[PDB]
């Protein structure tokens, strides 16, 4: 099936600050699946703008 967990000590979408900290931790990384529409931006600017429109698709699975 889809997106199940077993075994020992496995993790999805983890929180910040798992090590030793005397400063600032913010956010984390990203993971995406197959058969998807996902325009993407990674930016260290002073000002940043993302603008997207008009997306169509079937997005379907048959397993009879």
């Amino acid at each position: 099936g889809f997106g199940n967990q077993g075994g020992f000590g496995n993790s999805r979408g983890g929180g910040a600050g798992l090590g030793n900290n005397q400063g600032s931790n913010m956010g984390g990384g990203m993971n995406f699946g197959a058969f998807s529409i996902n325009p993407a931006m990674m930016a260290a600017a002073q000002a940043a703008l993302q603008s997207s429109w008009g997306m169509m698709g079937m997005l379907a699975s048959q397993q009879n």
Binding site: L49, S51, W53, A60
Partner: protein, 36 residues
């Protein structure tokens, strides 16, 4: 006069046991993102 249009006509699909998607989409223009 200014015109954007989609025309989609007549789907014949009797005794359907699988999967079907019949999709029509129309999107307007002249869009303007501004970063000063």
């Amino acid at each position: 006069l200014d015109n954007v249009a989609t025309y989609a006509g007549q789907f014949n699909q009797d005794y359907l046991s699988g999967m079907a998607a019949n999709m029509s989409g129309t999107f307007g223009g002249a869009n303007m993102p501004n970063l000063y």
